[PDB]
Amino acid sequence: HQPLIARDGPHPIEQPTHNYMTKIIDRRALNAAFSLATEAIALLTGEAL
Amino acid sequence: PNDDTEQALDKILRGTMRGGAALIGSPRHHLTRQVILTDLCQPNADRAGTLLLALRHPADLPHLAHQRAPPGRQTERLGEAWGQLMEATALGSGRAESGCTRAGLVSFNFLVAACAASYDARDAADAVRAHVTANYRGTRVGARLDRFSECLRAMVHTHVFPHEVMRFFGGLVSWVTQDELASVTAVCAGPQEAAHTGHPGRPRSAVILPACAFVDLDAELGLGGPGAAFLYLVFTYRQRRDQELCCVYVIKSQLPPRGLEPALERLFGRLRITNTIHGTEDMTPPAPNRNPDFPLAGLAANPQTPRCSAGQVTNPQFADRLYRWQPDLRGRPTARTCTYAAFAELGMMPEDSPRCLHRTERFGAVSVPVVILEGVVWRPGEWRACA
Amino acid sequence: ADGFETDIAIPSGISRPDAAALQRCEGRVVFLPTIRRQLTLADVAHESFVSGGVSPDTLGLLLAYRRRFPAVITRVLPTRIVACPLDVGLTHAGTVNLRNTSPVDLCNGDPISLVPPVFEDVRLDSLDLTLRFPVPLPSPLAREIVARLVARGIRDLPDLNVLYYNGSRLSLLALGPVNAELRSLVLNMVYSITEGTTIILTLIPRLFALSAQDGYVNALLQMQSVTREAAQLIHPEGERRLPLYEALVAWLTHAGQLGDTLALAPVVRVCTFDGAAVVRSGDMAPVIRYP
Amino acid sequence: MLADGFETDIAIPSGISRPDAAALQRCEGRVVFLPTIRRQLTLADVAHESFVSGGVSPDTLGLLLAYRRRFPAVITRVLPTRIVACPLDVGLTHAGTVNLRNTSPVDLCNGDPISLVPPVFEGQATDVRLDSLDLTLRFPVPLPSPLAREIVARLVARGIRDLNPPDLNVLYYNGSRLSLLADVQQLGPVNAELRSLVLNMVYSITEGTTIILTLIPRLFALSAQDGYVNALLQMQSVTREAAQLIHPEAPALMQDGERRLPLYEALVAWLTHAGQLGDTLALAPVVRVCTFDGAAVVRSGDMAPVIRYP
């Protein structure tokens, strides 16, 4: 809401301006890596138990 | 002792159910299909597990010889030879069918009997030519042999080389039959042994090759020992105004594709010398004793020799002041006419000791010396000229 | 699963005509800097290939495609562009559809290399970038079609336009800016070959001066032979010296530079299965890489 | 390539001094020349003692031909009993990726093909010794592919000086100044290199080449106008001083010139012999680099992801 003043001059303000602002947000995406070794797979699975 | 029985029982039951993707893609495998006339291929005769070779859809041929031939040779010798071959088909001689029925493939056993007169074991080679004439479904088959071998003689003379036109296509696994045309199923990439035959009575097949073209460089090089081997497709060329030669070989060797060239030189170097001497007729010499040597080593020493700057050259005021040198080259036997045997990457055998057999089969009732290979994994490659 | 898929994010602000062209470009070859999961579209565009200052020419696009990594676009979501790289992602899946931008038809069992669009265009208005897609034409034609366009440029300082493959005509001429776009490739040909054909002619001072067709073969065969007689068949042995041995090395590197450029290796082979063997223009072709 | 790949096993002899066991664990990623693709071999087969020729110790320039006769393979993991390696000409792994540690002075960039060079450079000559087994291990240096074509060109041009009773030692790359260690070269393998040159040198000369030689006055006029043409000659080429003296001109008219294209035939024969020759002297660039978490520079002394190059 644009705030207004009634100015002392009788000259016309001609229009007030009241509008809506729309903004597109943005997007980013994060990253990580977890890597496991060869023999660690079979030990969690049970192939080497 | 119970835990050892449990550990054995657990490992087998876990070993079956935990198998990833339900054993669908445990062999990596690929398949091809193509619908082609039975003109130069007889998959009814040539059974599952033989080589196939694709063509270049021969409308390109008769003017590529007009473009790429050495000067002095004939241009229309290729086109007149090919037109007689399509006459010998007696089925597609009318040319009216376009886009389909290419007769694009050539079976390997047909190509052996075309170049059969150039081999060594003539008794083995004539046995190959027998069931080509006998076991094929067609009349006057030996007429097709005489045209197509003359076509291959016309390939090398008109200098459009067959290895630029021939290309590897996968090995036979199954075929669906009709008159004059067969749906051909083949395996382009991967192991040959993984390909499902379709007959439940007889599972997986292998590679079948005639013993005329199969060459092992483990013998003549004397190199024993185990190891993997690289299968190859090797042609032979003999360029002369005479009727020319052709052969096809399948060579089993431990050598890389980067190092095959001194080995093929040791076999076919006798043919290599001939196409350097001959194969230049009729290519006219220049006038004798015309050519001077290079004064470039000589004129660079004296500063008093006249030079040119970048603003001088392309003006005739200084074109006469400089040295004039006119080379001629019309008598040069250069390497494209020094061509001979050419090869390509075909496939490898991952066995520790490669397995080869030498059996005779029918092909009723022609008994043919046949080399049977086992466990062939296909990797096609580019062609390569040894010139 | 275990199939690898690069995800290219489109920046928002697409107008309805701009997404329709990107909807249409389904099977095409697209390069990228490094194999990675998520990636912007700014590294895809033709603007990302520049060195200045200068939009890159045909010579630089051949040099870039060695360092860039080829990928074929899969289905195109409105969110992201999912594409799989050829060299790592295809070794598990095995089959990828691919649409020709080439006017030359494809037979079964052919090896296909990639050529920059020199034979002869998509630009986006709202996103302020251009797209250039290379041409997937067969590799035996690839050594030919490049060498035909080089042969035209030497004539700038019979018909070269005739190329008949599998029963079809081709017109290389079809004009203006194609010639000047290719000018840098022409100069590195002539500078390589003439520097080749002076050093060999300086080390052998009488190649041309030797007698025709019979002594030259005898000079060829002894040089062609394998035997130990090698060096005495070659070499000719204040004042300035011709720097020949340094000019050897600078020419070998320049010749060694162009070996990687003009190989045009068979990245892609097409195996037609359950369909016609001939694959024509604007048709999706299945792709199987080397195992 | 198989579905699992193919992994050779190099067995270790039982007599091991414990410091030599830790020396093998530093060889985590190196390049190993196998003579065959046999599944089981020994360390004596890998090492420099079997890698010699009959009675004669090979030099640096003669060691290149010994490479292309054999099979380069990369060690994956060092086990206490054996060493597991994967060949390169065979399809390399199940996954398509190998780690390679840089025993190289020069960092690596993405996408560049790797050829490999003997230990040549000064200072960094490092050969692992297995003194319990009395073995010596000379491991090759992985390098980018235009660099390897320089080093072969520097060595081969050095041997041609030895047949003629200055200077050529210094290279440059990324601004680094580096020379190379070499004392003598055997006269045997130089002739094998030189005969491989001049046969491929001659086979580029065809009838269209003399037509191309008429454009030598055009380039020396064109280098006046554009600096891009000045980037050719470099003042060390023959053709700058060759254009200053010789004014050649074309032969006319060619036999059967209507049917044929002489300029086209000269180029295709040139592309198959002279442009091929970067492959003919050294071995092929089988391997390029594709980092996955994108590292534009692979530093000297670090591993790198590895993918075959056609």
Measured CA to CA, the distance from residue D305 to residue A35 in angstroms comes to 14
In the chain, the amino acid numbered B187 is V
Contact C96, C285 (CB under 8 A): no
CA distances from B242 to A24, B153, C34 (A): 80, 10, 57
Closest residue on chain D to B255 (Cα): D69
The answer to whether C6 and C85 are in contact (CB under 8 A) is yes
Q: How far does CA D181 lie from the centroid of its chain?
A: 17
Q: Where are the alpha helices (DSSP H) in chain C?
A: 16-24, 58-67, 90-93, 139-155, 176-181, 183-203, 215-224, 244-261
Is B277 in CB contact (< 8 Å) with chain C? yes
Q: How far is CA B308 from the centre of its chain?
A: 52
Most distant CA pair in chain A, distance:
94
Secondary structure of residue C189 in the 3-state scheme: helix
Q: Which residue of B has its CA nearest to D257?
A: B71
The answer to whether A24 contacts C38, with C-beta atoms less than 8 Å apart, is no
Pairwise CA distance, residues B18 & B12, whole Å: 10
- SS3 per-residue string spanning C167-186: CCCCECCCCHHHHHHCHHHH
Measure in Å the smallest separation between the Cα of C8 and chain A Cα atoms: 12
Reading phi first (left if > 0) and then psi (alpha if -120 to 50, else beta), residue D212 is in alpha
Q: Which two tokens stand for residue D263?
A: 């300029």
With beta carbons less than 8 A apart as the criterion, state whether D15 and D132 touch: yes
Check CB contact under 8 Å for C226 and B262.
Answer: yes
Q: In the structure encoding, which two tokens stand for residue C8, read together?
A: 């290219």
**Distant-in-sequence, close-in-space partners of B22: CB < 8 Å, separation ≥ 6:** none
Q: b or e along D193-229 (b: 16 or more beta carbons within 10 Å of the residue's beta carbon)? A: bbbbbbbbbbbbbbbbbbbbbbbbbbbbbbbeeeeeb
Distance of CA D172 to the CA centre of its chain: 17
Distance from CA of B59 to the nearest CA of C (A): 5
Tokens matching residue C211: 């007698």
- Residue C60 backbone dihedrals phi, psi, to 5 degrees: -75, -35
Rg (CA), chain D: 23
Contacts of C153 (CB under 8 A, 6+ apart): C179, C182, C183, C185, C186
Give A42's contacts in chain B (Cβ within 8 Å). Answer: none
In which element (H, E) is residue B249 found?
A: strand B245-253
CA distance B368 to B109: 11
Contact C189, C150 (CB under 8 A): yes
Chain C interface test: which of B35, B68, B294 (most C C-beta within 10 Å): B294
Confirm if D262 and D206 have CB atoms less than 8 A apart.
Answer: yes
Residue C60's Cβ-count burial label (10 Å; 0-12, 13-18, 19+) is: middle
* Residue D248 sits at the chain B interface (C-beta within 8 Å): yes
Residues 6 or more apart in contact with residue C194 via CB below 8 angstroms: D212, D213, D215, D216, D219, D239, D242
DSSP conformation letters of chain D: --SS---EEEE--S---HHHHHHHHT-SS-EEEESS--SEEEHHHHSTTTTS-SS----STTHHHHHHTSEEEEEEEE-SSEEEEEESSS---SSS-EE----SSS-EETT-EEEEE-S-BSS----EEETTTTEEE---EEEEHHHHHHHHHHHHHHHHHTT-------EEETTEEE-B------HHHHHHHHHHHHHHHHTT--HHHHHHGGGHHHHHHHTTT-HHHHHHHTTTSHHHHHHTTEEE------TTTTT--HHHHHHHHHHHHTTTHHHHSS----EEE--SS--SEE-TT---EEEE--
Token pair for residue B264? 């093929």
Of the candidates B60, B67, B285, which has an alpha carbon nearest to the alpha carbon of residue B158?
Answer: B67
Give the integer Cα–Cα distance in Å for B223 and B197: 36
Give chain B positions within 8 Å (CB) of C212.
285-286, 288, 291, 331-332
Cα–Cα dist B196/B214, whole Å: 26
User: Which residues in chain A have their CB less than 8 angstroms from residue B14's CB?
Assistant: 46-47
Cα D242 from Cα B366, distance rounded (Å): 69
What's the rounded Cα separation, in Å, for the pair B329 and B351? Answer: 51
- How determined? cryo-EM
How many Å apart are CA A36 and CA C168, to the nearest integer? Answer: 55
Query: Which of C79, C219, C196 lies closest to D237 in space, CA to CA?
Result: C196
For residue C266, give how far its alpha carbon lies from the nearest alpha carbon of chain B (Å): 8
Amino acid at B71: P
The resolution, in Å, is 4.3
Q: Which residue type sits at D47?
A: A
Spatial distance between the Cα atoms of B317 and B307, rounded to a whole number of angstroms: 12
- List C-alpha distances in Å: D175 to C246, C252, D85, D170, D171: 19, 21, 35, 12, 10
Report D:209-228 residues touching B (Cβ under 8 A). 209-210, 213, 217-218, 220-221, 223-224
- Residues of chain B in contact with residue C275, where contact means CB-CB under 8 angstroms, are 33
Q: Which chain D residue shows the shortest CA-CA distance from B261?
A: D280
Buried b / exposed e along B129-139 (16+ C-beta atoms within 10 A):
bbbbeebbebe
Query: In this complex, how many residue pairs, one in chain A and one in chain B, have their CB atoms less than 8 Å apart?
Result: 3
- The answer to whether B85 and B144 have CB atoms below 8 angstroms apart is yes
Cα–Cα distance list, C133 to C28, C40, C117, D95 (Å):
7, 17, 7, 29
Which residues of chain C does B273 touch, with a Cβ-Cβ cutoff of 8 Å? Answer: 221, 224
Residue numbers in A near C37 (CB within 8 A): 31
Neighbours of chain B (3+ CB pairs under 8 A): A, C, D
**Token pair for residue D296?**
């534009």
* Beta partners for residue B378, in sequence order: B190, B347
- How far apart, in Å, do the first and last CA atoms of chain C sit? 18
Nearest-angstrom CA–CA distance, D126 and D101: 14
**Are B28 and D251 an interchain contact pair (Cβ–Cβ within 8 Å)?**
no
The span from the CA of D257 to the CA of C158, in Å, is: 8
Which alpha helices (H) appear in chain A, and where do they start and end?
38-45
Give the tokens for residue B147.
Answer: 């045209």
Strands (E), B63-218: 105-107, 167-169, 171-178, 181-187, 190-191, 207-210, 214-216
Q: How far apart are CA B65 and CA B55, in angstroms?
A: 16
User: DSSP string of D276-294?
Assistant: THHHHSS----EEE--SS-
- Cα dihedral B78, B82, B84, B85 sign: positive
- State the DSSP string of B335-364: TTTS---EEEEEEEE--SS--EEEEEE-ST
> How far apart (Å, rounded) are the C-alpha atoms in residues B352 and D40?
9
Closest CA to C36 of D110, D293, A34: D293
Residues 100-159 of C with CB under 8 A from B: 107-111, 139-140
- Contact residues, chain A, for C9 at CB < 8 Å: 27
User: Can you tell me whether residue C247 is helix, strand or coil?
Assistant: helix
- Residue D61: both structure tokens together: 């320039």
What is the distance between the alpha carbons of residues B103 and C166, in angstroms, rounded to a whole number? Answer: 13
Burial class, B191, CB count within 10 angstroms (exposed 0-12 / middle 13-18 / buried 19+):
buried
Of the candidates B278, D61, D191, the one whose C-alpha atom is nearest the C-alpha of residue C226 is D191
Pairing status of strand B323-325 against strand D246-248: parallel
Identify the sign of the CA torsion D186, D189, D195, D198: negative
Distance (Å, whole) CA C230 – CA C225: 9
The answer to whether residue B304 neighbours chain C at the CB level (below 8 Å) is: no
Q: Residue B323: is it exposed, middle or buried by C-beta count within 10 angstroms (0-12/13-18/19+)? A: middle
* For D310, nearest residue in chain B (alpha carbons): B381
Side chain identity at D241, as an amino acid letter?
E
Q: What's the token pair of residue D11?
A: 């067995």
- The position carrying tokens 């048709």 is C283
Interfacial D residues in 249-308 facing B (CB < 8 Å):
249, 251, 254-256, 259-261, 265, 269, 272-273, 279, 283-284
